[PDB]
Structure 1
Amino acid sequence: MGWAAAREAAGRDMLAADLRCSLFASALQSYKRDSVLRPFPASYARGDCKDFEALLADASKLPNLKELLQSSGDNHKRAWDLVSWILSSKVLTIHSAGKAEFEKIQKLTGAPHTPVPAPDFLFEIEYFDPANAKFYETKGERDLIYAFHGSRLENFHSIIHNGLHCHKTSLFGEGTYLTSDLSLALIYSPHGHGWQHSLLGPILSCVAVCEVIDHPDKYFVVTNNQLLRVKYLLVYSQ
Protein backbone atom coordinates (compact mmCIF):
# COMPACT_ATOMS: atom_id res chain seq x y z
CA MET A 1 0.00 0.00 0.00
CA GLY A 2 3.05 2.24 0.66
CA TRP A 3 5.71 3.39 -1.87
CA ALA A 4 8.45 1.42 -0.13
CA ALA A 5 6.34 -1.83 -0.22
CA ALA A 6 5.35 -1.41 -3.92
CA ARG A 7 9.04 -0.87 -4.83
CA GLU A 8 9.79 -4.19 -3.08
CA ALA A 9 6.76 -6.04 -4.76
CA ALA A 10 7.67 -4.69 -8.28
CA GLY A 11 11.33 -5.66 -7.60
CA ARG A 12 10.61 -9.31 -6.73
CA ASP A 13 8.43 -9.89 -9.79
CA MET A 14 8.46 -7.19 -12.51
CA LEU A 15 6.44 -9.24 -14.99
CA ALA A 16 3.66 -9.91 -12.34
CA ALA A 17 3.70 -6.12 -11.44
CA ASP A 18 3.62 -5.25 -15.19
CA LEU A 19 0.79 -7.69 -15.86
CA ARG A 20 -1.27 -5.90 -13.13
CA CYS A 21 -0.43 -2.47 -14.66
CA SER A 22 -1.31 -3.81 -18.16
CA LEU A 23 -4.68 -5.28 -17.06
CA PHE A 24 -5.45 -1.96 -15.26
CA ALA A 25 -4.55 -0.01 -18.48
CA SER A 26 -6.76 -2.40 -20.55
CA ALA A 27 -9.82 -1.91 -18.20
CA LEU A 28 -9.24 1.89 -17.96
CA GLN A 29 -8.92 2.41 -21.80
CA SER A 30 -12.06 0.34 -22.50
CA TYR A 31 -15.27 2.18 -23.45
CA LYS A 32 -16.72 -0.14 -20.69
CA ARG A 33 -14.29 1.31 -18.02
CA ASP A 34 -17.26 2.12 -15.71
CA SER A 35 -18.26 -1.57 -15.63
CA VAL A 36 -14.84 -3.29 -16.10
CA LEU A 37 -12.54 -0.98 -14.02
CA ARG A 38 -13.81 -2.51 -10.75
CA PRO A 39 -11.99 -2.18 -8.32
CA PHE A 40 -11.50 1.58 -8.95
CA PRO A 41 -8.89 3.74 -7.08
CA ALA A 42 -10.84 5.64 -4.34
CA SER A 43 -8.53 8.72 -4.70
CA TYR A 44 -10.11 9.34 -8.14
CA ALA A 45 -13.70 9.25 -6.81
CA ARG A 46 -15.49 12.24 -5.15
CA GLY A 47 -18.56 10.24 -4.11
CA ASP A 48 -19.77 7.59 -6.56
CA CYS A 49 -18.38 10.02 -9.18
CA LYS A 50 -15.41 8.51 -10.96
CA ASP A 51 -12.82 10.98 -12.29
CA PHE A 52 -11.99 8.99 -15.44
CA GLU A 53 -10.33 11.96 -17.24
CA ALA A 54 -8.02 12.51 -14.20
CA LEU A 55 -7.27 8.74 -14.11
CA LEU A 56 -6.60 8.39 -17.92
CA ALA A 57 -4.38 11.50 -17.58
CA ASP A 58 -2.27 10.05 -14.68
CA ALA A 59 -2.13 6.49 -16.16
CA SER A 60 -0.82 7.95 -19.54
CA LYS A 61 2.06 9.72 -17.66
CA LEU A 62 3.30 6.40 -16.10
CA PRO A 63 6.81 5.42 -17.22
CA ASN A 64 7.80 1.75 -17.55
CA LEU A 65 8.56 0.03 -14.18
CA LYS A 66 12.41 0.03 -14.72
CA GLU A 67 12.20 3.85 -15.08
CA LEU A 68 9.79 4.17 -12.09
CA LEU A 69 12.08 2.11 -9.80
CA GLN A 70 15.04 4.36 -10.83
CA SER A 71 13.13 7.54 -9.76
CA SER A 72 11.92 6.87 -6.09
CA GLY A 73 9.53 9.82 -6.48
CA ASP A 74 9.34 12.45 -5.15
CA ASN A 75 7.93 14.70 -7.92
CA HIS A 76 6.47 11.40 -9.27
CA LYS A 77 4.05 11.09 -6.28
CA ARG A 78 0.93 10.56 -8.51
CA ALA A 79 2.59 7.68 -10.42
CA TRP A 80 3.68 5.92 -7.17
CA ASP A 81 0.26 6.41 -5.46
CA LEU A 82 -1.45 4.73 -8.47
CA VAL A 83 1.11 1.92 -9.01
CA SER A 84 1.12 1.28 -5.19
CA TRP A 85 -2.71 1.02 -5.46
CA ILE A 86 -2.59 -1.32 -8.54
CA LEU A 87 -0.09 -3.68 -6.77
CA SER A 88 -2.17 -3.90 -3.52
CA SER A 89 -4.40 -6.81 -2.27
CA LYS A 90 -5.00 -8.55 1.06
CA VAL A 91 -6.95 -11.32 -0.81
CA LEU A 92 -4.29 -12.63 -3.32
CA THR A 93 -0.96 -12.16 -5.24
CA ILE A 94 0.25 -12.95 -8.82
CA HIS A 95 3.61 -14.69 -9.38
CA SER A 96 5.58 -15.36 -12.59
CA ALA A 97 5.83 -18.97 -13.68
CA GLY A 98 8.31 -20.60 -16.09
CA LYS A 99 7.45 -22.41 -19.36
CA ALA A 100 8.12 -25.90 -17.94
CA GLU A 101 5.01 -24.62 -16.09
CA PHE A 102 2.95 -24.75 -19.29
CA GLU A 103 3.95 -28.50 -19.38
CA LYS A 104 2.42 -28.82 -15.87
CA ILE A 105 -0.87 -27.03 -16.93
CA GLN A 106 -0.98 -29.25 -20.09
CA LYS A 107 -0.52 -32.30 -17.79
CA LEU A 108 -3.45 -31.13 -15.48
CA THR A 109 -5.72 -30.50 -18.51
CA GLY A 110 -4.48 -33.60 -20.42
CA ALA A 111 -3.29 -34.14 -24.07
CA PRO A 112 -3.73 -30.81 -25.99
CA HIS A 113 -6.27 -32.60 -28.34
CA THR A 114 -6.27 -29.61 -30.76
CA PRO A 115 -2.88 -27.87 -31.73
CA VAL A 116 -2.61 -24.58 -29.82
CA PRO A 117 0.16 -21.87 -29.10
CA ALA A 118 2.37 -21.81 -25.97
CA PRO A 119 1.79 -18.63 -23.83
CA ASP A 120 4.54 -16.00 -24.05
CA PHE A 121 4.12 -15.42 -20.21
CA LEU A 122 2.60 -17.64 -17.43
CA PHE A 123 1.36 -16.43 -14.01
CA GLU A 124 0.26 -18.33 -10.89
CA ILE A 125 -2.24 -16.76 -8.42
CA GLU A 126 -1.72 -17.30 -4.67
CA TYR A 127 -4.78 -16.89 -2.38
CA PHE A 128 -4.49 -15.93 1.19
CA ASP A 129 -6.40 -17.24 4.25
CA PRO A 130 -9.39 -17.26 5.14
CA ALA A 131 -10.33 -17.88 1.42
CA ASN A 132 -7.42 -20.32 0.60
CA ALA A 133 -8.10 -22.56 3.66
CA LYS A 134 -11.88 -22.23 3.05
CA PHE A 135 -11.44 -23.39 -0.54
CA TYR A 136 -9.54 -26.61 0.54
CA GLU A 137 -12.13 -27.18 3.32
CA THR A 138 -14.94 -27.07 0.68
CA LYS A 139 -12.70 -29.36 -1.48
CA GLY A 140 -12.38 -32.06 1.22
CA GLU A 141 -11.81 -35.59 -0.16
CA ARG A 142 -12.93 -34.38 -3.71
CA ASP A 143 -10.23 -34.01 -6.38
CA LEU A 144 -9.31 -30.79 -8.24
CA ILE A 145 -10.00 -30.44 -11.96
CA TYR A 146 -8.30 -27.79 -14.25
CA ALA A 147 -10.24 -26.13 -17.10
CA PHE A 148 -9.93 -22.97 -19.21
CA HIS A 149 -11.93 -19.75 -19.55
CA GLY A 150 -11.07 -17.12 -22.18
CA SER A 151 -12.26 -13.51 -22.05
CA ARG A 152 -11.55 -10.05 -23.53
CA LEU A 153 -8.38 -8.48 -21.97
CA GLU A 154 -10.41 -5.55 -20.46
CA ASN A 155 -12.10 -8.11 -18.06
CA PHE A 156 -9.07 -9.62 -16.27
CA HIS A 157 -8.45 -6.73 -13.76
CA SER A 158 -11.93 -7.50 -12.39
CA ILE A 159 -11.52 -11.34 -12.81
CA ILE A 160 -8.30 -11.21 -10.73
CA HIS A 161 -9.94 -9.15 -7.90
CA ASN A 162 -13.62 -10.21 -7.88
CA GLY A 163 -13.40 -13.52 -9.73
CA LEU A 164 -15.65 -14.99 -12.40
CA HIS A 165 -17.95 -13.23 -13.10
CA CYS A 166 -20.10 -11.82 -10.19
CA HIS A 167 -23.87 -12.12 -9.51
CA LYS A 168 -26.81 -7.98 -10.21
CA THR A 169 -27.28 -11.43 -11.98
CA SER A 170 -31.01 -10.81 -12.99
CA LEU A 171 -31.12 -13.81 -15.46
CA PHE A 172 -31.45 -17.57 -14.68
CA GLY A 173 -28.95 -20.30 -15.73
CA GLU A 174 -25.97 -17.97 -15.03
CA GLY A 175 -22.52 -19.57 -14.42
CA THR A 176 -18.92 -19.83 -15.73
CA TYR A 177 -18.01 -21.53 -19.05
CA LEU A 178 -15.07 -23.86 -18.93
CA THR A 179 -13.36 -26.39 -21.22
CA SER A 180 -10.41 -28.76 -20.96
CA ASP A 181 -9.48 -27.68 -24.55
CA LEU A 182 -7.47 -24.46 -24.63
CA SER A 183 -8.16 -24.10 -28.36
CA LEU A 184 -11.86 -23.55 -27.52
CA ALA A 185 -10.99 -21.10 -24.66
CA LEU A 186 -8.63 -19.11 -26.90
CA ILE A 187 -11.34 -18.14 -29.46
CA TYR A 188 -12.95 -16.17 -26.54
CA SER A 189 -9.56 -14.47 -25.71
CA PRO A 190 -9.08 -11.92 -28.57
CA HIS A 191 -6.12 -9.51 -28.56
CA GLY A 192 -6.87 -6.29 -26.67
CA HIS A 193 -4.96 -3.16 -25.80
CA GLY A 194 -2.62 -3.35 -22.81
CA TRP A 195 -0.02 -0.79 -21.74
CA GLN A 196 2.34 1.01 -24.15
CA HIS A 197 5.22 0.74 -21.58
CA SER A 198 4.70 -2.92 -20.77
CA LEU A 199 7.61 -5.46 -20.79
CA LEU A 200 4.94 -7.95 -21.98
CA GLY A 201 4.19 -5.93 -25.08
CA PRO A 202 1.34 -3.49 -25.84
CA ILE A 203 -1.17 -6.01 -27.40
CA LEU A 204 -2.10 -9.04 -25.26
CA SER A 205 -4.54 -11.93 -24.98
CA CYS A 206 -5.20 -13.72 -21.69
CA VAL A 207 -6.77 -17.10 -20.83
CA ALA A 208 -7.63 -18.17 -17.30
CA VAL A 209 -6.81 -21.63 -15.95
CA CYS A 210 -9.47 -22.43 -13.30
CA GLU A 211 -9.09 -24.82 -10.39
CA VAL A 212 -12.47 -26.63 -9.92
CA ILE A 213 -13.51 -28.88 -6.98
CA ASP A 214 -14.89 -32.04 -8.71
CA HIS A 215 -18.65 -31.83 -7.98
CA PRO A 216 -21.66 -32.93 -10.21
CA ASP A 217 -21.75 -29.86 -12.59
CA LYS A 218 -16.35 -30.22 -25.31
CA TYR A 219 -17.09 -27.80 -22.38
CA PHE A 220 -19.00 -27.52 -19.02
CA VAL A 221 -20.65 -24.81 -16.78
CA VAL A 222 -20.13 -24.19 -13.00
CA THR A 223 -23.17 -22.56 -11.37
CA ASN A 224 -21.67 -22.45 -7.79
CA ASN A 225 -18.93 -19.73 -7.60
CA GLN A 226 -17.57 -21.27 -4.31
CA LEU A 227 -16.30 -24.43 -6.12
CA LEU A 228 -13.81 -22.68 -8.50
CA ARG A 229 -11.12 -20.03 -8.56
CA VAL A 230 -8.61 -18.70 -11.13
CA LYS A 231 -5.17 -20.36 -10.53
CA TYR A 232 -3.15 -19.38 -13.66
CA LEU A 233 -3.15 -16.75 -16.40
CA LEU A 234 -1.81 -17.56 -19.87
CA VAL A 235 -0.63 -14.40 -21.61
CA TYR A 236 0.03 -14.09 -25.38
CA SER A 237 1.75 -10.97 -26.79
CA GLN A 238 1.00 -9.98 -30.41
Structure 2
Amino acid sequence: SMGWAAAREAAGRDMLAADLRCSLFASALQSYKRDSVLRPFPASYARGDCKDFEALLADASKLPNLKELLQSSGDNHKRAWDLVSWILSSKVLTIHSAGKAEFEKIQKLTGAPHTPVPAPDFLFEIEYFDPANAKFYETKGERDLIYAFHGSRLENFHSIIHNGLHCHLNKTSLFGEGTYLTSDLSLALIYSPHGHGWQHSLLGPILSCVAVCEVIDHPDVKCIPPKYFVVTNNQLLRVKYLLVYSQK
Protein backbone atom coordinates (compact mmCIF):
# COMPACT_ATOMS: atom_id res chain seq x y z
CA SER A 1 0.00 0.00 0.00
CA MET A 2 0.99 3.76 -0.09
CA GLY A 3 3.50 5.19 2.38
CA TRP A 4 2.37 7.88 4.89
CA ALA A 5 3.67 10.91 2.90
CA ALA A 6 1.92 9.65 -0.27
CA ALA A 7 -1.33 8.96 1.69
CA ARG A 8 -1.22 12.42 3.27
CA GLU A 9 -0.99 13.98 -0.25
CA ALA A 10 -3.80 11.66 -1.61
CA ALA A 11 -6.13 12.50 1.37
CA GLY A 12 -5.36 16.27 1.17
CA ARG A 13 -6.31 16.31 -2.56
CA ASP A 14 -9.90 15.16 -1.77
CA MET A 15 -10.69 15.08 1.96
CA LEU A 16 -14.39 14.13 1.48
CA ALA A 17 -13.56 11.14 -0.81
CA ALA A 18 -10.84 9.97 1.68
CA ASP A 19 -13.42 10.39 4.49
CA LEU A 20 -16.06 8.38 2.52
CA ARG A 21 -13.55 5.46 2.18
CA CYS A 22 -12.76 5.57 5.97
CA SER A 23 -16.56 5.70 6.68
CA LEU A 24 -17.36 2.69 4.43
CA PHE A 25 -14.39 0.79 5.96
CA ALA A 26 -15.79 1.61 9.47
CA SER A 27 -19.35 0.55 8.44
CA ALA A 28 -18.14 -2.84 7.06
CA LEU A 29 -15.84 -3.44 10.08
CA GLN A 30 -18.50 -2.53 12.75
CA SER A 31 -21.23 -4.72 11.16
CA TYR A 32 -21.82 -8.21 12.67
CA LYS A 33 -21.23 -9.29 8.98
CA ARG A 34 -17.55 -8.00 9.05
CA ASP A 35 -16.22 -11.55 8.26
CA SER A 36 -17.92 -11.50 4.83
CA VAL A 37 -18.29 -7.71 4.09
CA LEU A 38 -14.87 -6.40 5.21
CA ARG A 39 -13.22 -7.60 1.99
CA PRO A 40 -10.56 -6.54 1.09
CA PHE A 41 -9.19 -7.04 4.62
CA PRO A 42 -5.85 -5.40 5.75
CA ALA A 43 -3.25 -8.27 5.75
CA SER A 44 -1.33 -6.71 8.72
CA TYR A 45 -4.39 -7.73 10.94
CA ALA A 46 -4.37 -11.33 9.73
CA ARG A 47 -2.22 -14.33 10.76
CA GLY A 48 -2.61 -16.47 7.61
CA ASP A 49 -6.33 -17.44 7.46
CA CYS A 50 -6.99 -16.01 11.00
CA LYS A 51 -8.39 -12.46 10.79
CA ASP A 52 -7.88 -10.56 14.05
CA PHE A 53 -11.11 -8.46 14.08
CA GLU A 54 -10.76 -7.51 17.79
CA ALA A 55 -7.28 -5.93 17.15
CA LEU A 56 -8.64 -4.27 13.97
CA LEU A 57 -11.77 -2.85 15.73
CA ALA A 58 -9.52 -1.69 18.60
CA ASP A 59 -7.17 0.17 16.14
CA ALA A 60 -9.98 1.64 13.98
CA SER A 61 -11.43 3.20 17.19
CA LYS A 62 -8.05 5.05 17.58
CA LEU A 63 -8.38 6.91 14.24
CA PRO A 64 -8.80 10.68 14.77
CA ASN A 65 -10.84 12.75 12.29
CA LEU A 66 -8.91 13.24 8.99
CA LYS A 67 -8.29 17.00 9.56
CA GLU A 68 -6.60 16.22 12.93
CA LEU A 69 -4.74 13.25 11.41
CA LEU A 70 -3.34 15.62 8.69
CA GLN A 71 -2.89 18.70 11.07
CA SER A 72 -0.58 16.55 13.26
CA SER A 73 2.78 14.84 12.53
CA GLY A 74 3.03 11.17 11.38
CA ASP A 75 4.60 9.48 14.47
CA ASN A 76 1.70 10.87 16.67
CA HIS A 77 -0.83 8.41 15.11
CA LYS A 78 1.34 5.45 13.82
CA ARG A 79 -1.31 2.62 13.67
CA ALA A 80 -3.82 5.22 12.41
CA TRP A 81 -1.52 6.26 9.50
CA ASP A 82 -0.81 2.57 8.58
CA LEU A 83 -4.57 1.85 8.45
CA VAL A 84 -5.59 5.08 6.60
CA SER A 85 -2.72 4.51 4.04
CA TRP A 86 -4.10 0.96 3.35
CA ILE A 87 -7.77 2.28 3.16
CA LEU A 88 -6.77 4.89 0.49
CA SER A 89 -4.61 2.54 -1.54
CA SER A 90 -5.81 0.90 -4.72
CA LYS A 91 -4.12 0.23 -8.07
CA VAL A 92 -7.56 -0.52 -9.64
CA LEU A 93 -9.58 2.63 -8.86
CA THR A 94 -9.90 5.95 -7.05
CA ILE A 95 -12.86 7.99 -5.77
CA HIS A 96 -13.51 11.70 -6.45
CA SER A 97 -15.93 14.15 -4.83
CA ALA A 98 -18.40 15.36 -7.48
CA GLY A 99 -20.77 18.37 -7.75
CA LYS A 100 -24.27 19.46 -8.91
CA ALA A 101 -23.11 19.42 -12.60
CA GLU A 102 -22.48 15.63 -12.30
CA PHE A 103 -25.76 15.03 -10.32
CA GLU A 104 -27.73 16.90 -13.09
CA LYS A 105 -25.93 14.64 -15.63
CA ILE A 106 -27.00 11.49 -13.60
CA GLN A 107 -30.66 12.73 -13.52
CA LYS A 108 -30.50 13.23 -17.34
CA LEU A 109 -28.93 9.78 -18.01
CA THR A 110 -31.48 7.95 -15.77
CA GLY A 111 -34.52 10.09 -16.53
CA ALA A 112 -36.77 12.35 -14.44
CA PRO A 113 -38.01 10.46 -11.30
CA HIS A 114 -41.61 9.14 -11.56
CA THR A 115 -41.98 9.61 -7.74
CA PRO A 116 -40.51 12.30 -5.32
CA VAL A 117 -36.88 11.63 -4.29
CA PRO A 118 -34.43 13.46 -1.97
CA ALA A 119 -31.30 15.11 -3.40
CA PRO A 120 -28.05 13.46 -2.12
CA ASP A 121 -25.89 15.35 0.42
CA PHE A 122 -22.70 14.13 -1.31
CA LEU A 123 -21.92 12.64 -4.70
CA PHE A 124 -18.81 10.68 -5.64
CA GLU A 125 -17.41 9.32 -8.89
CA ILE A 126 -15.37 6.11 -9.21
CA GLU A 127 -12.47 6.40 -11.73
CA TYR A 128 -10.94 3.10 -12.92
CA PHE A 129 -7.31 2.53 -13.99
CA ASP A 130 -5.86 0.01 -16.49
CA PRO A 131 -6.18 -2.98 -16.96
CA ALA A 132 -9.77 -2.70 -15.49
CA ASN A 133 -10.65 0.57 -17.34
CA ALA A 134 -9.36 -0.67 -20.78
CA LYS A 135 -10.99 -4.13 -20.14
CA PHE A 136 -14.45 -2.50 -19.59
CA TYR A 137 -14.16 -0.42 -22.82
CA GLU A 138 -12.94 -3.49 -24.82
CA THR A 139 -16.11 -5.36 -23.63
CA LYS A 140 -18.24 -2.27 -24.53
CA GLY A 141 -16.90 -1.80 -28.08
CA GLU A 142 -19.38 0.42 -30.00
CA ARG A 143 -22.33 -0.63 -27.68
CA ASP A 144 -24.26 2.07 -25.76
CA LEU A 145 -23.98 2.64 -22.00
CA ILE A 146 -27.07 2.48 -19.73
CA TYR A 147 -27.14 4.06 -16.24
CA ALA A 148 -29.13 2.34 -13.48
CA PHE A 149 -29.31 2.27 -9.66
CA HIS A 150 -28.52 -0.35 -7.05
CA GLY A 151 -29.42 0.20 -3.42
CA SER A 152 -27.73 -1.70 -0.59
CA ARG A 153 -26.98 -1.61 3.14
CA LEU A 154 -24.10 0.78 3.99
CA GLU A 155 -21.84 -2.04 5.35
CA ASN A 156 -21.74 -3.62 1.82
CA PHE A 157 -20.26 -0.60 -0.04
CA HIS A 158 -16.54 -1.09 0.91
CA SER A 159 -16.84 -4.58 -0.75
CA ILE A 160 -19.15 -3.35 -3.61
CA ILE A 161 -16.52 -0.72 -4.60
CA HIS A 162 -13.39 -2.92 -4.41
CA ASN A 163 -14.87 -6.26 -5.61
CA GLY A 164 -17.77 -5.04 -7.80
CA LEU A 165 -21.43 -6.08 -7.45
CA HIS A 166 -21.92 -9.89 -7.02
CA CYS A 167 -23.28 -11.52 -10.22
CA HIS A 168 -23.96 -14.72 -8.26
CA LEU A 169 -25.86 -17.12 -10.50
CA ASN A 170 -27.70 -19.30 -7.94
CA LYS A 171 -30.05 -21.87 -9.56
CA THR A 172 -31.29 -23.04 -6.08
CA SER A 173 -32.94 -19.64 -5.23
CA LEU A 174 -35.85 -17.22 -5.89
CA PHE A 175 -33.23 -14.37 -6.37
CA GLY A 176 -30.13 -15.95 -8.05
CA GLU A 177 -30.49 -14.52 -11.57
CA GLY A 178 -27.53 -12.07 -11.15
CA THR A 179 -27.26 -8.34 -10.26
CA TYR A 180 -30.63 -6.54 -9.85
CA LEU A 181 -30.70 -2.88 -10.96
CA THR A 182 -33.46 -0.30 -11.42
CA SER A 183 -33.92 2.84 -13.57
CA ASP A 184 -35.89 4.42 -10.69
CA LEU A 185 -33.88 5.98 -7.79
CA SER A 186 -37.00 5.78 -5.54
CA LEU A 187 -37.04 1.94 -5.87
CA ALA A 188 -33.28 1.71 -5.20
CA LEU A 189 -33.55 3.98 -2.08
CA ILE A 190 -35.87 1.52 -0.27
CA TYR A 191 -32.89 -0.97 -0.47
CA SER A 192 -30.49 1.65 1.00
CA PRO A 193 -31.44 2.09 4.71
CA HIS A 194 -29.42 4.50 6.87
CA GLY A 195 -26.48 2.70 8.51
CA HIS A 196 -23.72 3.49 11.00
CA GLY A 197 -20.63 5.02 9.37
CA TRP A 198 -17.68 6.58 11.22
CA GLN A 199 -18.10 8.77 14.34
CA HIS A 200 -15.24 11.12 13.26
CA SER A 201 -16.57 11.52 9.67
CA LEU A 202 -16.94 14.90 7.89
CA LEU A 203 -20.01 13.35 6.20
CA GLY A 204 -21.79 12.59 9.49
CA PRO A 205 -21.98 9.33 11.50
CA ILE A 206 -25.19 7.95 9.84
CA LEU A 207 -25.31 7.41 6.08
CA SER A 208 -27.34 5.85 3.26
CA CYS A 209 -25.59 5.04 -0.01
CA VAL A 210 -26.91 4.22 -3.54
CA ALA A 211 -24.73 2.95 -6.43
CA VAL A 212 -25.10 4.38 -9.93
CA CYS A 213 -23.91 1.71 -12.37
CA GLU A 214 -22.64 2.04 -15.92
CA VAL A 215 -24.09 -0.91 -17.84
CA ILE A 216 -23.06 -2.08 -21.35
CA ASP A 217 -26.21 -2.44 -23.57
CA HIS A 218 -25.88 -6.20 -24.37
CA PRO A 219 -28.38 -9.17 -24.80
CA ASP A 220 -27.16 -10.65 -21.40
CA VAL A 221 -28.63 -7.52 -19.67
CA LYS A 222 -32.26 -8.70 -19.15
CA CYS A 223 -34.99 -5.99 -18.99
CA ILE A 224 -33.59 6.43 -20.02
CA PRO A 225 -36.02 4.21 -17.99
CA PRO A 226 -36.96 0.43 -18.05
CA LYS A 227 -38.16 -0.21 -14.38
CA TYR A 228 -35.95 -2.98 -12.76
CA PHE A 229 -33.56 -5.35 -14.72
CA VAL A 230 -30.95 -8.19 -14.25
CA VAL A 231 -27.25 -8.39 -15.29
CA THR A 232 -25.96 -12.02 -15.51
CA ASN A 233 -22.34 -11.17 -16.53
CA ASN A 234 -20.17 -9.04 -14.11
CA GLN A 235 -18.04 -7.84 -17.11
CA LEU A 236 -21.07 -5.85 -18.45
CA LEU A 237 -21.29 -3.34 -15.55
CA ARG A 238 -19.31 -1.27 -13.07
CA VAL A 239 -20.22 1.09 -10.22
CA LYS A 240 -19.60 4.63 -11.51
CA TYR A 241 -21.18 6.94 -8.87
CA LEU A 242 -22.11 6.86 -5.20
CA LEU A 243 -25.11 8.90 -3.95
CA VAL A 244 -24.67 9.60 -0.24
CA TYR A 245 -27.45 10.73 2.14
CA SER A 246 -26.49 11.94 5.59
CA GLN A 247 -29.12 11.66 8.36
CA LYS A 248 -29.59 15.00 10.17
Instruction: Report if aligned partners of 1:210, 1:230 keep a CA contact under 8 Å in 2.
Output: yes
Question: Residues 29 and 115 (structure 1 numbering): CA distance in 2 closer, same or farther, change over 3 Å?
Answer: same
Q: Percent identity?
A: 100
Question: Residues 89 and 104 (structure 1 numbering): CA distance in 2 closer, same or farther, change over 3 Å?
Answer: same
Once residues 122 and 175 of structure 2 are traced to their aligned partners in structure 1, the CA distance between those partners, rounded to angstroms, is 36
Question: Residues 193 and 105 (structure 1 numbering): CA distance in 2 closer, same or farther, change over 3 Å?
Answer: same
Deviation at 1:75, TM superposition (A): 3.4
The SS at the match of 1:4 is helix
Once residues 186 and 144 of structure 2 are traced to their aligned partners in structure 1, the CA distance between those partners, rounded to angstroms, is 24
Unaligned segments of structure 1, at least 5 residues: none
Question: Residues 52 and 173 (structure 1 numbering): CA distance in 2 closer, same or farther, change over 3 Å?
Answer: closer
Q: Deviations over 1:164-206 (max 9, x none)?
A: 0264999984311111100000000000000000000000000
Instruction: Report if aligned partners of 2:216, 2:236 keep a CA contact under 8 Å in 1.
Output: yes
Residues 46-55 or 24-33, more deviating: 46-55
Question: Residues 182 and 78 (structure 1 numbering): CA distance in 2 closer, same or farther, change over 3 Å?
Answer: same
Residues 153-162 or 208-217, more deviating: 208-217
Instruction: Report if aligned partners of 2:148, 2:183 keep a CA contact under 8 Å in 1.
Output: yes
Instruction: Report if aligned partners of 1:92, 1:128 keep a CA contact under 8 Å in 2.
Output: yes
Q: Deviations over 1:130-161 (max 9, x none)?
A: 11111111111110000000000000000010
Question: Residues 223 and 166 (structure 1 numbering): CA distance in 2 closer, same or farther, change over 3 Å?
Answer: closer
Once residues 158 and 173 of structure 1 are traced to their aligned partners in structure 2, the CA distance between those partners, rounded to angstroms, is 19
Question: Residues 32 and 169 (structure 1 numbering): CA distance in 2 closer, same or farther, change over 3 Å?
Answer: farther
Question: Residues 205 and 43 (structure 1 numbering): CA distance in 2 closer, same or farther, change over 3 Å?
Answer: same
Asked if residue 232 in structure 1 is aligned to residue 241 in structure 2, the reply is yes
1:54-69 equivalence runs, <5 A:
54-69=55-70
The SS at the match of 1:74 is helix
Residues 3-12 or 133-142, more deviating: 133-142
Question: Residues 86 and 166 (structure 1 numbering): CA distance in 2 closer, same or farther, change over 3 Å?
Answer: farther
Residues 121-130 or 170-179, more deviating: 170-179
Q: Deviations over 1:9-67 (max 9, x none)?
A: 10000000000000000000000000000000000001111111111111001100000
Q: Deviations over 1:72-107 (max 9, x none)?
A: 220311000000000000000000000222111000
Question: Residues 209 and 68 (structure 1 numbering): CA distance in 2 closer, same or farther, change over 3 Å?
Answer: same
The SS at the match of 1:159 is helix
Instruction: Report if aligned partners of 2:167, 2:178 keep a CA contact under 8 Å in 1.
Output: no
Correspondence for 2:86:
85
Residues 168-177 or 113-122, more deviating: 168-177
Once residues 104 and 98 of structure 2 are traced to their aligned partners in structure 1, the CA distance between those partners, rounded to angstroms, is 11
Q: Number of residues paired by the alignment? A: 238
Once residues 72 and 166 of structure 1 are traced to their aligned partners in structure 2, the CA distance between those partners, rounded to angstroms, is 43
Unaligned segments of structure 2, at least 5 residues: 221-226
Once residues 169 and 15 of structure 1 are traced to their aligned partners in structure 2, the CA distance between those partners, rounded to angstroms, is 42
